[PDB]
Amino acid sequence: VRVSVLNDALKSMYNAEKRGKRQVMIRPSSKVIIKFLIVMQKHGYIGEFEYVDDHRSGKIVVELNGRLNKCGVISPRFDVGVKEIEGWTARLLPSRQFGYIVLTTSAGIMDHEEARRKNVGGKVLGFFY
């Protein structure tokens, strides 16, 4: 059964990205999916995306710009403090120069650099680079 809609969204988006598609459809939508997409768009890895209200769960149509190499969730959502971020950076990321890890801290959903800025920890949602 659909146990993690975030994984389905990220996997469909990555599969469409590898095939050179310019748009991708994500169903069902959710607030955490929207926040993850907002972070990715703010850092400049995707472009426009619009939520469509189907009165049941909503869909998302996302516009790709070819800049996204990989994006994927981490399951189960392990708990990381501020001192463990570096370790996870050495595991999920290509290099220390770029890449991003998404954390769902109690201050919201953000990237790992912002979490270090605010000195807060939380669980790991996924990653993208």
Binding site: S75, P76, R77, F78
Partner: protein, 139 residues
């Protein structure tokens, strides 16, 4: 495939605990049978030369390996120990005092010698190497 739940620590721990037994080395060490070997978990041992024997080397080799049937003094078991360094069978006599060691493969036959896992290191309190190189004489 694997159980990836965050609440599934017990399942993973128990599964690994069960599956460690298929390991050859782990099962060898944790079954406790290593104490029933002649050395009983000792690096060396001491013994009495019961007799001097020769064993034909396994095919395709062709030679006679000068071994020695000895009896350990710590438990009374009878084992065959190799005698290297040609001419060193002469130094060994009957009912003599020898120090035996493993052959090198940790309880496995070494070389073409059929079923020999020990080698003679000392005889009558003198090393075979010293007698072989004429550094020492048998007392």
């Amino acid at each position: 495939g694997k159980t990836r739940g965050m609440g599934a620590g017990r399942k993973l721990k128990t599964h690994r605990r069960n599956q460690r037994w298929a390991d050859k080395a782990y099962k060898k060490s944790h079954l406790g049978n290593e104490w029933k070997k002649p050395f009983a978990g000792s690096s060396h041992a001491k013994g009495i030369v019961l007799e001097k024997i020769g064993i034909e080397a396994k095919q395709p080799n062709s030679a006679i390996r000068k071994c020695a049937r000895v009896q350990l003094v710590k438990n009374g078991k009878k084992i065959a120990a190799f005698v290297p360094n040609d001419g060193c069978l002469n130094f060994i006599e009957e009912n003599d005092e020898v120090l035996i060691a493993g052959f090198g493969r940790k309880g496995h036959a070494v070389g073409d010698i059929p079923g020999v896992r020990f080698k003679v290191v000392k005889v009558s309190g003198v090393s075979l190497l010293a007698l072989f190189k004429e550094k020492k004489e048998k007392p």
